[PDB]
Amino acid sequence: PQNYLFGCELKADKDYHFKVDNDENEHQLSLRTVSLGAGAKDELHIVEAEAMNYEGSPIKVTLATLKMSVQPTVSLGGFEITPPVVLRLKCGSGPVHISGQHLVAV
Amino acid sequence: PQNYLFGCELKADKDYHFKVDNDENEHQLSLRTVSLGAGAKDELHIVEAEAMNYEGSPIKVTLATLKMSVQPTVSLGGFEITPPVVLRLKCGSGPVHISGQHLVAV
Amino acid sequence: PQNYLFGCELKADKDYHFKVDNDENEHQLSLRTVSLGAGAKDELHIVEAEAMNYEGSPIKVTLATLKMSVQPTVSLGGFEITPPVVLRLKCGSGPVHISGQHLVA
Amino acid sequence: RPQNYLFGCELKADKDYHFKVDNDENEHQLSLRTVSLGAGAKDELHIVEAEAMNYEGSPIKVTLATLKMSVQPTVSLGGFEITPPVVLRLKCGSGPVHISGQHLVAV
Amino acid sequence: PQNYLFGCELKADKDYHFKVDNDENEHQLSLRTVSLGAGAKDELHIVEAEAMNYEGSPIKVTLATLKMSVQPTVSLGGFEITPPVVLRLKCGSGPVHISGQHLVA
Ligand SMILES: [Cl-]
């Protein structure tokens, strides 16, 4: 369970797509924090994730609701998600930063 | 321990029923975040879970108390519940979003 | 490790005692969240737990300080305590809800 | 796998806390869960610090939490495990500040 | 999994560099809390970490955004990073304190 640092930045329509690699290994994203960037406005920001569900259909789940003067950072504690996954801002202009661990298994 | 994205949205007249069907494997719901939706009033929101306790009886349980201008998101850190589970808003109009993992055994 | 839902509501004159039976397994309370109920006043609420320490004596312990307009909910991340455990409000009138898991060997 | 006992203490401006090992064989761990301000604490900045050995072998002071009654009365650390010997103290603020956690033992 | 206490302080002109000197065992930095020091102004503080991604390249990630009058402490719950790691203030002058665990197999 070797682990690499992971991160991305979201904007109004700057998605992040985490893909499956053409390796033989398993991969997981263990999401840790969502936090507002210095230039973010004091509006509501909602970060959303999209991935396969249990019965096979795409699901969109909101990870966090952030606002600069109320809650600039949310800690998710190692939210593990199997790729492919898309991360995006459902509202707010961002930037919103996401940090976490990229877990593989050779 | 296979792992899928889970999410739902609750409103005052909209609960969520997590079931698990005529499967053979064991299933667990691992709840990660509870967060207020973009249009939610600045009223008190209380999210409830109902499931079996160890004595065999159904128990109603408060997961989180949320308020948009005080605490829009609560992180539960992987709160596991054995299905069947009903999730509902005990008060507040929502929308309230819940995200987590659906974990499956064999 | 079997896990069942656990929850309770605490008020000024209402301790909560956890419990077990003529049982054969190991039991743990895994406390998850502490949250103020809808009718709680905007007073400071302090939730306390009491259980035996490593020496063997009962020790009272503050789990959380809550205030409705400041921090209505606290997440403990799976705080595990061996029964018997008493939960109570050391101050505030409540209602205060506690949620967690009952774990069985 | 290890056995777990409830742990707690109260810190004030002139009352620190030191984690007591004894003439025993067991490996002990202190797992800290919450830091929360007591009812009578004033509304100043409170900073809780922990003191224990680092890897290279010499003592390090470390900040666990910054708390303020009207902003953030409780901080949950999620099971911060520290090997004894460890000392907990207020680096500033008058308290009382309560600490809760687990005392874990295994051999 | 031997476990030692870890800490550092960050300022506008003072970063922290975590190297384990090449022994033969493996080391991990497990971050726990990011908190503002007593002397910090009430400006936005953003703490970032730099290490390798899975493709071998260095990446910088924001760990936490703090502000004294809003949220002086963020708890990361054991965010493990493989050394070498750089911690720095991307904005704000600090001091910002970091605590966690240094783990050796
Ligand atoms: Cl706040």
Beta bridge partners of E81: E29
Q: Closest Cα partner for A32 from B73, E31, B65, E98?
A: E31
CA distance C13 to B104: 42
CA distance E25 to B55: 47
Q: Closest Cα partner for E72 from D18, D27, D37, A54?
A: D37
> Nearest by CB to B79, which of C32, C37, C97?
C32
CB contacts under 8 A, A 27-56 vs B, are 28, 44, 46, 49-54
Extended beta strands in E14-57, E state: 16-18, 27-36, 45-52
Phi, psi of A23, deg, nearest 5? -85, 180
Domain ranges for chain A: 1-106
Q: Do the beta carbons of residue D79 and residue D32 sit within 8 Å?
A: yes
Tell me if the bond preceding D59 is cis, omega within 30° of 0.
Answer: no
Q: How far is CA C23 from CA B81, C33, C83, D84, in A?
A: 23, 27, 12, 34
Can you read off the two tokens belonging to residue B24?
């053979």
Task: Inspect the interface and report whether the beta carbons of D54 and E6 lie closer than 8 Å.
Answer: yes
Method: X-ray
What are the chain A neighbours of E54 within 8 Å (beta carbons)? 4, 6, 27, 102, 104
Given CB atoms, is D23 within the 8 Å cutoff of chain C?
no
Tell me if the bond preceding D73 is cis, omega within 30° of 0.
Answer: no
Can you read off the two tokens belonging to residue E59?
């990446």
Can you read off the two tokens belonging to residue E9?
């302080």
Q: How far is CA C6 from CA A57, C32, C79, E30, in A?
A: 32, 9, 13, 30
State the smallest CA–CA distance between residue A40 and chain E in angstroms: 11
- What's the angle, vertex CA C52, arms to CA C85 and CA D11, rounded to 5? 100
Can you read off the two tokens belonging to residue A18?
């985490």
What are the chain A neighbours of E71 within 8 Å (beta carbons)? 71-73
Given CB atoms, is C98 within the 8 Å cutoff of chain D?
no
Phi, psi of A93, deg, nearest 5? -95, -15
CA distance B31 to B26: 16
CA distance B60 to B56: 13
Q: Do the beta carbons of residue C95 and residue C16 sit within 8 Å?
A: no
CA distance A50 to A11: 16
State the smallest CA–CA distance between residue B47 and chain C in angstroms: 10
Q: Which residues have a Cβ under 8 Å from the Cβ of E35 and sit 6 or more positions away?
A: D47, D63, D64, D65, D66, E66, E72, E73, E74, E96, E97, E99
| Sheet of E27-36, strands arranged across | E2-10, E96-104, E27-36, E73-81
> Nearest by CB to D73, which of C50, C70, C91?
C70
Q: How many Å is the Cα radius of gyration of chain D?
A: 14
Q: Which residues have a Cβ under 8 Å from the Cβ of B91 and sit 6 or more positions away?
A: B43, B44, B45, B46, C38
Q: How many residues does chain D have?
A: 107
Q: Do the beta carbons of residue E47 and residue E64 sit within 8 Å?
A: yes
| Sheet of C85-91, strands arranged across | C16-18, C85-91, C45-52, C58-66
CATH topology of domain D1-107: Jelly Rolls (2.60.120)
The residue behind tokens 């908190």 is E35
Q: Which residues have a Cβ under 8 Å from the Cβ of E4 and sit 6 or more positions away?
A: D52, D53, D54, D55, D83, E101, E102, E103, E104
Helix (H), strand (E) at residue D104: strand D97-106
State the smallest CA–CA distance between residue E88 and chain A in angstroms: 15
The CATH number of C1-105 is 2.60.120.340
Q: Do the beta carbons of residue D38 and residue C62 sit within 8 Å?
A: yes
CA distance B68 to E66: 19
The subunits that touch chain C, with at least 3 C-beta pairs less than 8 Å apart, are: B, D
Q: Do the beta carbons of residue D91 and residue D47 sit within 8 Å?
A: yes
User: DSSP per residue over A50-95, as a string?
Assistant: EEE-TTS-EEEEEEEEEBTTTBSEEEEEEEEEPSSEEEEEEES---
Task: Inspect the interface and report whether the beta carbons of A76 and B33 lie closer than 8 Å.
Answer: yes
Helix (H), strand (E) at residue D66: strand D59-67
CA distance B9 to B11: 7
The subunits that touch chain D, with at least 3 C-beta pairs less than 8 Å apart, are: C, E
Given CB atoms, is C69 within the 8 Å cutoff of chain D?
no
State the smallest CA–CA distance between residue D8 and chain C in angstroms: 5
Q: Closest Cα partner for B47 from B29, B65, B67?
A: B65
Q: Residue C69 Cα, ligand 1 centroid: separation in angstroms?
A: 8
Can you read off the two tokens belonging to residue D52?
């224990």
CA distance D90 to E5: 18
The one-character DSSP state at B74 is E
With the CA atoms of B10, B13, B16 and B17 taken in that order, what torsion angle do they form, in degrees rounded to the nearest 10?
Answer: 170
Measured between CA atoms, the residue of chain D closest to residue C79 is: D33
Letter string b/e over residues E34-73, b meaning 16 or more CB atoms within 10 A of that residue's CB:
bbbbbebeeebbbbbbbbbebeeeebebbbbbbbbebbbb
Q: Which residues have a Cβ under 8 Å from the Cβ of B23 and sit 6 or more positions away?
A: none
**If you count residue pairs, one on D and one on E, with CB atoms under 8 Å apart, how many are there?**
86
Can you read off the two tokens belonging to residue E22?
């090449």
CB atoms within 10 A of CB D17: 16
Helix (H), strand (E) at residue B36: strand B27-36
Instruction: Say if strands A96-103 and A3-10 run parallel, antiparallel, or are unpaired.
Output: antiparallel
Q: Residue B27 Cα, ligand 1 centroid: separation in angstroms?
A: 36
CATH topology of domain B1-106: Jelly Rolls (2.60.120)
State the smallest CA–CA distance between residue B78 and chain A in angstroms: 8
Can you read off the two tokens belonging to residue C42?
């905007």
State the smallest CA–CA distance between residue A1 and chain B in angstroms: 14
Can you read off the two tokens belonging to residue B47?
């999210």
Given CB atoms, is A103 within the 8 Å cutoff of chain B?
no
CA B102, B104, C1, C7 torsion-angle sign: positive
Given CB atoms, is A88 within the 8 Å cutoff of chain E?
no
Given CB atoms, is B69 within the 8 Å cutoff of chain C?
no
Q: Which residues have a Cβ under 8 Å from the Cβ of D89 and sit 6 or more positions away?
A: D11, D16, D17, D48, D49, D51
Q: Do the beta carbons of residue A25 and residue A105 sit within 8 Å?
A: yes
